[model samples]
Each structure stands twice: as structure tokens, then as C-alpha cells.
Target: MDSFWFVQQWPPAVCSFQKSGSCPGSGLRTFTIHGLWPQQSGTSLTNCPGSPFDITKISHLQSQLNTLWPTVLRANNQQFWSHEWTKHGTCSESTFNQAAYFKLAVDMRNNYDIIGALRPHAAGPNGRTKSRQAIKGFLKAKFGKFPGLRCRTDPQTKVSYLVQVVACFAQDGSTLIDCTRDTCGANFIF
Candidate 1:
């Protein structure tokens, strides 16, 4: 059975970069859905066979996706969604088609509320934070499983901030499961 990793970004700690109009800045304060990635044995599968995403076909989901899964790196969110569709959505064809794939991810993001879920566990703000044990505790208590946490160090500061929260789902993409299959060091920031 195939599984998926539903990743969400912690905006405060995300790297600051110049965009077409302006910097993404704290406007990205809330956690945003990253992508529903297909995984095999803890590794991601990409560039699978599928039809390229056509916005017109799924124009209905644009507004919701924009609010929930935007790309901080660019002004046009279309590229972000397109990249996600091509890389991750393609591999989920067995369960969901193009529109269905995006919809499922949005639904999960709404239901889970990554930002809300993390607030209880967060300590300070920005890149100042906690350990894996602390996060795994609350998440598991609430959802029956703890998701995976991905962290990255700021080049200048040398502090590792938590970037992504990856929730694993069963083949059906509805049931949440422990993502203990992937592990990281004790050091974590937010």
C-alpha cells in the first residue's frame, strides 16, 4: 500500500527572500500546507506519469489552495501548485485524480490545522524552540500519531529551525499514522 506525507511549513522560521513584488515576510506567519508527497520506504517518489495540471480544469480550488498552500518564493502561486502536482500529485493517481488530489490535501490541511496544532507545543517565537520529544508528545496524544519534523539551520545564526511538519497517511489518505519511520536529532527550533 502506498502512503503519503502531508507537509506543512512553519512560516516564521522560513528563509527570507526577495520576491517579485515584496518579501513574503511574516504574512506567512501561519503554517501553510506544503504538498501531499507519495513515499516508499521513507523516500519520496517524483516525476510520475500523469497529465500536467490545467488550472482551468481545477479553477474551483484556486482560492482555497492559494490560502492554504501558497509558495513564499514567488508571487504567482500557480507555479507552486503546478510543481506540487507534477512532483507529488502524479504519484497519487491510484487514489485521486488531479482535482481530487488537490482537494484531499486541502481537506487534510483544514482538518489538521498545523498552526493550531503546534501552538500548544511551541515555546518562544521565530527560530527559538523545543525538542522532538515535546512535539511528538502532544501530536500523538491528540491524533493517535506523531508526524515527522524537518529542520534546517540558518547559515548566519547556526540555529536549526523547524521548517516542515510531515503527517503520514494511510493509502486512503484519511487515516493518520505514526511517522516514526523517519527520525531526526534531539535539536529542534520553531
Candidate 2:
């Protein structure tokens, strides 16, 4: 694992997919954590063998995790967190332990305000079409690096919806780096 991709998901866009199942409550309007994926040469390094996912290890961060990293598709937030830790977090165990790993994600979420960044530029998600380059430019101008944008196509309408924004970080987990993978089209719905 050379770097980290701190991926944040837009709930409304995520839940817009029918396969996402139930989104629990209504009015979810923030970017929640999808995962902190470790990448090796721009490729995801997943399912590395290390410590098993233990809920007790992150008990102290339960409160913040619930709000910032909740499982939107299902009712089980712990299950989602545990899956992320076991799949991605274990790969970076050498640098960040369970507590430190989750804390890093929480801190990243707090610091990388996507909505706040776009609001000033009138690029906030409004259920309409938005330029991919403009969105990336807005985030790059604010965060000092271009972020990876992921979009999902609605099967019914065939419209692409912006789903996830990824911020790459150096191995130290603090410095921001430019993301290389962007799966969105030139113009997509936000």
C-alpha cells in the first residue's frame, strides 16, 4: 500500500440506486465515508491479511462514526465499519492501528468539506446536471489536488449520478495528493 484513497459517498446519490436497498431514514444530505482504501500504484490493495475486525477496538469512536460513517444502505453500521476495517484498514496496520485508522477517517471527513467547498461556487448538488471538470476544479482549487469522482448510472433513466468523491493522501495520511481514477462522464447529474 503506497497511498490512501479516503472515499466519501454522497448519500442521496448513493441511495438513488434501487439496488442500494433501504437508506434507513430520509433527508440524508451529507457526504459520508465509504472507506479509506489503500492503493498500490493507483490500484486498490484490498483484503490483505492482518488483524481481524473488532468492534471493541473502535468503541470509543462509535458516536462520531455513527454520524460521519453510517451505513446508509442498511441498518448495521458496525457491520459496515467492520467490513471496511477487515478489507482495507488491515492493509495499513503497520502505520495506523484500529483506533488511529478510524480517527484518521473521521478527521479527514471533518476537514474535507465537499459541500462547503462547492456551496461558495454554486456547484452544490441540486439534482441537476453539473460539469465534471468544474466539480473537479472546484475541489482542486479548495483542496490543492484533483479528486477522483465516481458516478453511478440510473438503470431506469440512464442518467449518470455523482456518487463518490475520493481524496488521495500520502502514506503519512495527512498530506493531500491528486487522485488518478475518475469514473464520471464529462457531464453528470449531481
Candidate 3:
């Protein structure tokens, strides 16, 4: 267990476009916290068995979690939460428990509203878009440093779309820092 990084997965427009793919209601026009993954080096550690996920700890914030970090797939919300907690949450060292983990993630999601942030650069028929540098610049201005831009590719068209913007934090989860990794391309279709 080392520092942490989480990727917020943007709506899977590319996935829906596939012939066999089915995009559920939860999959459109929203970004969801994919996971608050713990990292050693640049690779993530999952299912660490460091802690057990108890759903009862987060019963109070269930509604807020649903709103801020909904599962885009059709799977039940409890299953989604359980999976994330078991896989990623258990990897955490001492910075959070089940309750605190969900709360912090929700608060972070509330802090950075991508819809509001990108409102000025709204997309149109051709799709409003920006470069990786520009996207990082805009977010870094508000979130400090170490923000990430993720892209999704439409397999059929072989075109990439800007999907999510991420910010990394210190292990204590108090301060923003530079990202340990980056895999974005030059053009990010929004």
C-alpha cells in the first residue's frame, strides 16, 4: 500500500456505439468514480485483504453516493459498492475505513463538478473538444496539480473521446499532487 489514485470514468459513448454493447440509463452524460485505487510504483494494488467491506458503515450516505458515484453498468448498486470496497477500498492502509472512504470520495466528487467546469467549453454537433495540455491546464487551475485526462476509444470508428478528468492526492488524502501516470492522447473529443 502506497499513495492513492482514482479514475473517474466518463460516460461510455463509445461503448454504446458498438453493435453488441448496451449502455444503460446510468451510462449517459455522467462521470463516475471508478475506484480510489491504491498504488505502489505506478501499478495499482487490488483486493489487498487489508480490510473487510461492511456496507452498514455507509448506510447514512448511501443516497449521496448514489448521486455522486453511481455505477454506470446495469449491476445493482450494492453489488457495485461491494465490489469497489472489496477490491480497491481494502487496499487502503489507515487513511480511511469503509464509512470514511465513501464519504471522502463523495466529497471529492462534489468538489469538482465536471459539468460546471466544462460548461464554457460545451460540445456541439461536431463535439466540443480540447487538447490534453489544455484540459489539464483548465483543471489544474482549480484543483492544483496532478490531474489526469482519460480517453475512451470507439472500437469500430477507431476514434477516441475524452471521458474523465482525474486528480491525485496525498496518502493522507489532504493535498493535491502530481499524477504518477498519464495515458491520454493529444486530441480529446468531448
Candidate 4:
């Protein structure tokens, strides 16, 4: 892969599409990890064969992962983590082993606080429409690169809700890079 797409998911937006009871609680107020995808020209590289997903490899990070990378769509967080490792994570296994890969994602989540960046600008999620350029500008101003914004449409209301923010990184998975795509429309619900 030439670069990485470190994607973070907004729980409220994600849960809105879930079946009645699929999403638990009120849904996390903050953005949680979707996955760290290895990409080449914006296309995700997935299902690369390498080490199989092993729970023990990331046991030390269970506490942090549970909170920061929880599976809002289901009850099993481990299953979600395992799926991600076997799919996207394996593609980068040569440079980042199982532990290092998960650790990198955790650290990325820590450093990229999307909500924190937007709140001070009064651009935080308020169940209302938000300009895509303004949202991207806010993050670009703080992080020095434009992030990809993804949105999902509510099947009933037909309103687009911002679902994911994707931060691009170099092949090494540390240095930030500008994302080339924005799947959301010009404006979307926050």
C-alpha cells in the first residue's frame, strides 16, 4: 500500500442505521475507530494474508481498545477487532506486527481528536446541517491536512449524516498527508 487511511467513526451517525436493538445504549458521543486501512491511490487493500488475528497479541491494549475502538454495531468488540486485523491490518503486517498495528491505531485515535478540534469552533455535531468545507477547514487548520469526510443517508428521512472522518498518512503510518477524497456532499448533518 502506498498510504494509510486512518478512519474514525461517529457513533451517533453509525447507530442511526443499525437495526432497532443492534446499537446499544445512547451510543458513544465521540468518534471511535473504524479501521486503519492500507490504501493505494485511495483504494483500500484488504484480506492480505499474513498472521491470523490473535486476541492474545493485543491483550495488553484491551482496556483502551474497548473504549476507543468499541464495536457500536454489535456486542462483540473482539470480533470487530479480529475482523479488522485479518482484513486491513494484515496488509501492513510487514511494517507493523499485530501488536504494533493495533497500538498505532490507538495512538492515532489519541492524537486525532476530531470532536475536540471542532467543538471550540462551534462546529461540533449538533444534529444539524454543517458545511463540508468548513468542517474540513477546521481539521486542516489544526492538523495541517484535509481529512476525508464520509456521510450516510437516513433511509427514512433521506438526510445525510456525517459518519466517518478519514485521516491520511504516509506509508510509514505516522506522517500526516492530505486526503484526496470526500464522500460527503457539500453539507451534511453533524
Candidate 5:
């Protein structure tokens, strides 16, 4: 893998819109972390919040972030996430969103309100580009255009959904990781 650069656009979930798609959530809860190297192997999300870290499932990521939110834990390591939410019931978008979570000081109204405090996640990206967007494009070449077989969505019914995290890294290579939402995130209607 190579280093990627981008501005923030969507939060919790990637910019799944097909050109100006009305998302149910807010903008890219963007956060930037520099100098991130891959983890050793054998990590998992379950073992992340617990003891005895699992390198294969969950890896450590850290970079020069804001002075306040200088570090955070992230998920989605080389996995494929998409409409799987309609099947699994929950996803780890929160983990990634938290990578850029920092607003305990400003005391803003829309704590997590789409365009309020979360917009800074990818503010430097010119438009709404985020670093993950670059990675998403890179992964597409390696893993192929997202939504393979595992990430497919269910159309018949809807409850909640789940999708394996694709490329996760912490805002800082630390243990205390933050998540944007508890239930993770869900897909939307077209």
C-alpha cells in the first residue's frame, strides 16, 4: 500500500453517493493522521476494545493530528464494506469516524451535526475529499470496485446492516479508540 491524501466529505460512512447523493448522515467526519504504517498481522475489532490486542483484525495507526485529538483507533483493514449493512445489522463506521473526532472544547451545538463540527475532518481537501477517499480509490484497484460478494446489500427486507471494515487505522497509535456512532452506520435508500 502507499500513502494517500484527500479532504473530508462524508462521515461515519464513505461518500457512497452517486454524485450528490442525499445521505442520511453528516459530512465526512474527517481527521488526519500522518506517518501511518501497517500493523503486524492477526488483528480483530472485537479484541480492540478489550485486552491482548489482535494485530490481524485491528492495527495501530497514528499521525500528527490536532493538539487536542492527536490520536484515535480505527478499523477497516483491507476488508470490503458496502451494502452489507442491510444484512449484518451494524457496521464499524463509527471507529473510522472517530479518527477525526475532536470537539470537547469548542462546545458547539451540533456536537456530531453533519456540517457543524465534523466538517473539519477533511477541511483541507479543497472540496470534500478525505484521505479515506484516496485509499478507497487505491483499494479499488487492488480489491476491485468495492461491493463485491460479501458487501452486497439485501433488498427484500430491512432491519439494520453490517459490513466488514475495509481499512482502519487509529488517529494515533494508541489503545483508546473512538467511534462516531454505537450501532455503527446503516445504508440509505436510493
Candidate 6:
């Protein structure tokens, strides 16, 4: 389990980059996580409704329902603690091994499947298509204000209000993205 994920109970919802800030200010602060994390993408379908009538913004929720188990299980068994912990020598086992975290990761990955069943959705809008317009559409549809003008507070801190959400499966099935030092490196895929 990666400290970033395992250390905290990631709100059963995807946090925008504003909430999951990059550095010192980071920590599920808003409704966006910069890059291609499976949680960021989604296609909300009630029952995978026969190839989607139009693949609404929420359609990712459904696609997620389909790929939820396989893809995430793969992410956990393959990514997580398996990649490396060369920097944090004391935090976890000195050596990183895929098999080491398989049990826990698989368990958590299954738990994430249940998460897909819920309708909490993603924080922002689509990154692939007309994202900007999609974002504006959400803001207007929900709060009648600018998406930027709206503010966010964790569900723990504030009551649940109708904030726009994109659904996790909408980001990308693969959660791996280059984590580079470039100012906006996290925004685009590698």
C-alpha cells in the first residue's frame, strides 16, 4: 500500500488537484487529482445500459463498474508497494515486492469495486473531450455559478452539497502517469 493511499481513507471519492494538492498544500484539498489515476476517470451507467445512449458525463461511472475489478486489482498487485520504496527506507519494507502487498492490495481493490456501485462520482469534468465546456455545464447545472467560484470542503468538514463530479473511470483505466518535477508535469500523461 502506498502511503499516499493506504495512510489515509481517500474519502470514497476522487479529490480534485485543489484538494489533492501537489506538495505542502496537498491532501485531498479540492476535487481533482492531476493525472491518469483510475479514480479520476469514470463512465456512470446504471447497468452498462447497452452501449450507452450518449455516454453522458456521468457515463464513466458505468464503464468503471465494468472494468472496476480487473483493472484496479491489476493496479494494486502491480503498482502500490511493488514499484519501489528506494526513497522511504524506513516507512515500509526496505525492498518493494509486488507479491508482498498482493493480499492487502487485492482486498482494497475489491473494496474499491463496491465504491463504484455508489454515485459519488469524480470531482471535475472530462479531460478528453470538451472539458472546459463540460466543466462550465456542470457549474451552471448545479450551482448556477462558475465552477471556479465554487469552493470545496471535505465531506468530513462540511455537509454534502451538489458539487459537480466526473466519476473515477472517466480519468483513465491505467493510473500510472509520469511523476516529474516539471511545473505541470502531473497534468499530462507521460
Residue-wise lDDT of candidate 2 within 77-123, one digit each (tens)? 99899899988999899989988999999999999999999999889
List candidate 2 segments past 4 Å from native: 19-21
Model 6: ten consecutive residues of lowest lDDT: 40-49
TM-score between model 5 and native = 0.19
- How does residue 62 of candidate 4 score in lDDT? 99
In model 1, the Cα lDDT at residue 106 comes to 89
Where does model 1 exceed 4 Å of error?
17-22, 120-127, 181-184
lDDT of 2 at 28: 74
TM-score of each: 0.88, 0.95, 0.86, 0.96, 0.19, 0.22
lDDT of 4 by residue, 104-138 (tens): 99999999999889999999988899999999999
Collision pairs in model 2: none
lDDT of 3 at 99: 87
Best-to-worst lDDT order: 4, 2, 1, 3, 6, 5
Q: Please give the lDDT score at residue 74 for candidate 6.
A: 23
Where does model 5 exceed 4 Å of error? 1-24, 27-165, 168-190
Candidate 6 wrongly placed segments (more than 4 Å): 1-4, 7-90, 94-98, 120-190
Query: Between 3 and 6, whose lDDT is larger?
Result: 3
lDDT of 3 by residue, 1-190 (tens): 5567766876554345445546553245677777677777777788877676678889999888777677666466778888998888877846688888888888777776666665566532136556777667667665668587777777777877876676787777656678845566888676
lDDT of each: 0.77, 0.90, 0.71, 0.92, 0.25, 0.26
TM-score (C-alpha) between model 6 and the true structure: 0.22
- Among the numbered candidates, top lDDT falls to 4
